[PDB]
Symmetry: D2
Subunit: 499 residues, 4 copies
């Protein structure tokens, strides 16, 4: 309704969302139920495209889309993105409501994501900061004398944007924005769990002037998307999700440009130096925000001997003084988890930690099929490494607390997990901070703040199992664009006189 | 002998080359024969490492190598590379001889490759031109106010360098150089066809001071290398070879940083504008150099109506006035092809073209199991697209000639092949050149010269089936290094006063 | 009136414009008459500040202005500039009218300048493209081992913007924009001939939120401004004007950062290669626009033997088929010159050329105290160098035409003038274009178009007598900002382990 | 002798050094005595060029030099610089001896400067890191659609390098290096006090292949150099010296590119946070090195209440435990000052401080016409600002010590001097360091180390009275090079299809 006026179809009491096939909304494949984690009820259905529609869509994106995007000058592409931002902003309440219902996101966080999407589109002007190239004069080698080089970038063509469930709106808008601003066409494949915010974002872009044959939104479940990733007309794949699916995506994709944001959690380190009030506050937030369903959620806290006591005590208080339930009461702090399955995994991970010597300091109580209390588990350094909570990413509001003798042990334990997305360090001493900055094997280190990618104002991405490459204003150009070198030969042509 | 004094083992009349296991030369796996394309005779044997030695080597590279390379300051790494250059240069004749014998490379081209390897090492100082980073002040967004960002690069750790047969020495030295200069350890896996130049380059590096536990040279045949690519301790794979193996490599590798130089041939375009003498000369060279066993070899010539006649006539004359045989007579122009199998493919591709309306303008005659004349085949535009010589890369001295009505048809035929490595354009008119530069889908375009990557003074790499990412002085840092972002939070700390 | 509602004072029938003293509009110094070149009539008066008000203003800019600008975060500075753009745009007709009346600018050119000013402000977002810095790791020298460097930019403080008469509105808005976006305070000193557009731009900026104590507009005549340039609180001087005043400005200023755009005219070269229709069209425009009162006006045309005839013939036709008179009839092409004195100089320069063998091909007739026909004077190469029109910049619609044997003579004659602002080259051949690009000693070379700085989308500035440094989106940051290096010492601190 | 074999002329027992006139050594102007501060004895004479020789030299540099430098490809320029480094290095003892005798430099510091000069030349390869340019695509504005921009740098032509007495060798080699590597010709004008090291450096460069008509060395006393600075053939002036002469230089020069390193001293701040042992050590060194005749010498120490006592006590001990006398005994720590006049100024400045409430904590005793003890004077915050030692730069081994309540007072007192070259901050807390980094108005801030420009590995330069622009590896290109923009117009030419 409203923005999706003539798109959505009320059939049998439940709104039915079609796929956008690079020209027209539609689809003739199986219909799929979309549910809310708030009550496990079916709030909508999405129409998945058939084999033939996928083939036809890719064919349109490749033969026409690449050129519609590329032949639309940057000044107009920018106007399209800014208009889209206006359209989403005036529809703010409706975008937010869908996030709250479809993703189980607390009202204030749902509003924050819509505003992030708006800002991202509006700041596409800043993405131009990394547009340019270089001139390489040839007289620095006898072999290249009287020769000359120009290097610039070019859009790759068709970019596939695969998105996770925890940021259904922002991630799709972000990927669409950086792919399009440089002249690419885009196929969006949102999570089948909450594909609704993506449908709304795309329509807004189409209403804003986005070349109709240069974008596609396909409601394909999991491995149904493999046929898109594996296709030669898709020159790049921008994927945000779990380490496991990412691995499958590259193996199916083969050679192409990839940006793989594979999350995992983040460790946070507290030096005897830290303002514990700031630290406790930021760490508590990092642990529970959106019920820990954030790639940059704090999963492990490492604090030096002299502050471990106070720090862990303060965080525990803050976590237990939270409010669970329905995401609507702006008084509530934590909503549900995307699936009861996710809560099961969390409970099993807490028992594991307890069996291995871990002790719950806050939470630990399941409240429903999709509800749980934010949990903080204390654990001795000599036993934490074998705990599931440490070796894996348990996507939920749960973190471990470990007392350490010094920075070297903190760094060592922080690097001991298989991931390397971000890390946080609270403290004041420049030398210890510099050491941690050099040795933490992660894409980004947050000094005196909890990790927060925001809209990518600062580039972010993983190391180790957390993936490869970065997203960020200006930086994402590297994943959806290729270099083009032009070498000019003026040997013996009289341009230079021996030089 | 000499440089390989105590390494090589004369066993049963044939020198036996061991693998370098990141600490000691050795190996206890199968021994493999290395032959010369000049006479199909066995000139040496290489010892391949066993499963256990591969495992132990990777373990050394990962646990110690990363740190030996990284903890050696750049100033010393540079001294190591410059010393290696001195060592290879004083052993020039011996490095060249091995190239001529093992690769079938003509004396002057073998000398050129050794000199390229020397220059590459010596110019590692220029690779530093892309060392730096940026400062991202946070006051351009209300959300990032009193915040601040630092972005820099870091070596990934262990880089796997897989190399082709056509540049056994330069490619290994190039990959080792750019991986090491930034602080990485490296596993080199050369072609099992001519692994000898690599063994000599590595020893020279080791004699020059290259951290002994930071490099490895494994004589593994084809799929034996898969276990290296698939290992999690290998953070990046730099591969130069065929499209097919590259595809297999990524599928085995999964998520990691990749530089894939997958070759294919290059098209060359001649406008009615061109100096035909320069064009004929450069195109003839591009067609026959090293018996067309160059990724940047000219495989297709497209010339406008008014110059097609003269141009094709001049190139034919130049190709037929060449001399085949043994690579030793500096009077000789073309040596043998790496295998008789490669010549078979070439002959079958020439008949195919003839059957589809193609006509031989020069060459076409096989001279031996590994010898053939450089061939130039004329073909009508309306039938060339289905010819094997057009649809595939026939690694041999053979190119098609096609008359075109204008630039648009030239561009269209040039883009019609599945590859996109380089393209050449001879002509003078700025407008037509700019159009071709924009529309040719290739990593690099050479204006008025045949395509030649040289030592990578200008970055190069593919598009389409030719691969992804670039190699070049300064640019290769992108494939063997990862970004690291440091975000500092000074909110409410009094650094700024509302700004 | 309107925008200047409570600022302007109707006194004795003529509007009186006060100076803005960094806080309040006012002034108690002599009043000065502002006239129109259209009828030599007094259209307004401006109040110049007294010695004391200049001193107090500088004191405010220095003690408070630097901090109001600097402590306003970039996000707000940008909002201020965008609001100012909205305000000027809705007042478009009024800004234009004042330009037509006060500057003698033809209606369509007056509208174009207001729109340029609007775009400049609106695109301040693009100026951020050159914001960043670099990280300089210290391990590339033994002396700097365990050391590290950060380099960034900082606003200088108080920037003095001195502007010419030919672009009274755009130049002030441009200088104010680039100085303010980086955090500087600004003192604007417009030409006393047409200071009205500047007063209107400043008020619009103040209405938009520009820190009131961070900007100043002083109506000081010529050498009265010297006291601003010579003051130590002025850290930078951005000057656009004649070579002579620029020289005086630096000598008075002493050591400080300078951007000196000193104009002079531009030469245009036509190769036998050129599309003469495009060339004739563009060159005619370059000669007459705004009655040649443009720093980038074409003052000399050099065409090779074979096209000289047609080219000069076409330009002559176009120049004589123009319409002079009052700048209001959108049917009119050329308005008056700023002063009768300027027309006198032009007539004397035409006779000089004639006396030295020059022949008028178009125009030559004076129409009034401030009116003249666009003139094109033919001249033999062997005598042109001593003609006033060649050795000087005669700010008027007048250019020389000279036939040349080849490119080398064209380049030589083009470089023979004492200026080096821009040069234009029409032709197609890449080699001849590259040669001209290398040898023309000018800040900017326009290929196949007349020179036009526009809003500085491409940086521009002089060489030789045309000055030093550049203005342009992103580039002007170099003149109003200084570098700041931070070197960190971690020697023996355990950050690095010998590296 | 040796290197200066056939150049120097033994006349009347004292070696006579001629000027190098861009082609031949010689000169026919007045001869001038060069003395040693070690014994006030005449150690040599230099021949100054006559009016005519200055005119002829400039004429050679302009008409031929610019082209000899520019037309020598970068690869050869680099070889020239590296050869020069070899030549100076093998003549190390002789270069050092002359520094010790002519400049009064302690043996170990004289050796350090020769080695700095050698490294500078040898690392000219790193200056290439800032060679490149940018491509500015035109589709981000409707006005620039189908347009395109290339920006690169070009040498200016003839650069004048004026050098101070405190680094007679390094400063000349540094300026010559960065001016020449980019293709400029250079006129060197060394201090008339110690012009000998410059003569030796130039000869070495000439022996190494430096284009003979592209360099000049003129022994002109003070204002005799004005005729070089004021000449239009000199496109840039690189000046290192006092604020006063710098001011005179620009006023004489008028419009041109300038790099003005005007020194002044540096303040050092010690937070209650600092390792006082490191601080005391570094600050003592910063105060006395080369008898404080360093632009980056510490002139003021500001330490917070709790460490002021220990810190000042430690520095005093270190300063008084030094050894004065003759610069030869490697056991000696401090040699003489360049002139007795310089010592007079120092003594008068110490009494002034004492009269205004200052108290000597170390030194204060004059030992001879050119000898003095390193002095440390304590002073109350409420009276220091009016002391000569604070308001001026007393080029000598003398600094003030002031106790401060906190960082804000330290920052305020540090910014209270009229200079702004460098500042040092010792401490650990990131927040206080960041605040000081933002608010100290200086070109460079050294964290936990004394200020040391070294060879310019990190760019350096002044703010306020300390001058404008920077010198440093890579950065100096900005002062001796100008931008060149090439704008290509393809409007309606079919390159782009509406974009
Ligand atoms: N900012 C930096 O990076 C830096 C580095 C090192 C030194 N410095 C500063 O520079 C000064 C160095 O000592 P210095 O005593 O030799 O100072 P200086 O007198 O100012 O040195 C001036 C240089 O300019 C020449 N000169 C003097 N008058 C001139 C004129 N009217 N026109 C053209 N050139 C003229 C001098 O030649 P004569 O010798 O013939 O008079 C000398 O070579 C100190 O204040 C120091 O702090 C700054
Ligand atoms: Na694939
Ligand atoms: Na893998
Ligand atoms: Na001054
Ligand atoms: Na001058």
């Amino acid at each position: 309704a409203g923005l999706l006026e003539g798109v959505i179809k009320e059939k049998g009491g439940v709104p039915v969302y079609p796929s956008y096939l690079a020209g027209e909304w539609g689809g003739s494949g199986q219909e799929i139920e979309v549910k809310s984690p708030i009550d496990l009820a079916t709030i909508a259905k999405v129409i998945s495209p058939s084999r033939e529609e996928v083939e036809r869509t890719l064919d349109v994106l490749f033969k026409r889309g690449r050129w519609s995007a590329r032949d639309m000058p940057g000044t107009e592409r920018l106007a399209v993105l800014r208009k889209a931002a206006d359209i989403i902003e005036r529809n703010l309440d409706v975008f937010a409501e869908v996030l709250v219902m479809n993703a189980g996101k607390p009202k204030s966080a749902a509003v924050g994501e819509v505003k992030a999407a708006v800002d991202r589109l509006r700041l596409a002007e800043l993405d131009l900061k990394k547009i340019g190239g270089d001139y390489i004069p040839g007289d620095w080698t006898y072999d290249t004398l009287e020769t000359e080089g120009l290097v610039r970038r070019e859009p790759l063509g068709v970019v596939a944007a695969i998105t996770p469930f925890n940021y259904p709106l922002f991630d799709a808008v972000n990927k669409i924005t950086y792919s399009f601003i440089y002249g690419n066409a885009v196929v969006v494949k949102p999570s089948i769990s909450d594909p609704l915010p993506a449908a709304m974002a795309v329509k807004a872009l189409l209403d804003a002037g986005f070349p109709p044959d240069a974008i596609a939104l396909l409601n394909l479940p999991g491995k149904e998307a493999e046929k898109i990733v594996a296709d030669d007309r898709v020159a790049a794949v921008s994927f945000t999700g779990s380490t496991e699916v990412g691995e499958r995506v590259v193996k199916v994709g083969g050679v192409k440009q990839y940006v793989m944001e594979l999350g995992g959690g983040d460790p946070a380190i507290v030096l005897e130096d830290a303002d514990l009030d700031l630290a406790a506050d930021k760490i508590a937030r990092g642990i529970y925000s959106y019920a820990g369903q954030r790639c940059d959620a704090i999963k492990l806290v490492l604090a030096e001997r002299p502050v471990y006591g106070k720090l862990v005590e303060e965080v525990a208080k803050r976590l237990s003084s939270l409010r669970v339930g329905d995401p609507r009461d702006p008084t509530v702090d934590v909503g549900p988890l995307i699936s009861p399955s996710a809560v099961d995994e969390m409970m099993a991970a807490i028992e594991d930690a307890v069996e291995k010597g871990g002790r719950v300091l806050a939470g630990g109580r399941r409240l429903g099929p999709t509800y749980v209390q934010p949990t903080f588990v204390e654990a001795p350094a000599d036993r934490v490494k074998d705990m599931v909570l440490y070796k894996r990413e348990v996507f939920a509001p749960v973190a471990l607390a470990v007392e350490v003798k010094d920075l070297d042990q903190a760094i060592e334990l922080a690097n001991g997990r298989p991931y390397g997305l971000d890390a946080a360090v609270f403290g004041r001493d420049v030398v210890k901070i510099r050491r941690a900055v050099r040795l933490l094997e992660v894409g980004a280190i947050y000094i005196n703040d909890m990790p927060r990618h925001g809209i990518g104002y600062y580039p972010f991405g993983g190391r180790k199992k957390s993936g490869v490459f970065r997203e960020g204003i200006g930086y994402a150009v590297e994943a959806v664009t290729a270099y083009k070198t032009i070498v000019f030969n003026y040997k013996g042509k009289g341009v230079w006189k021996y030089e």
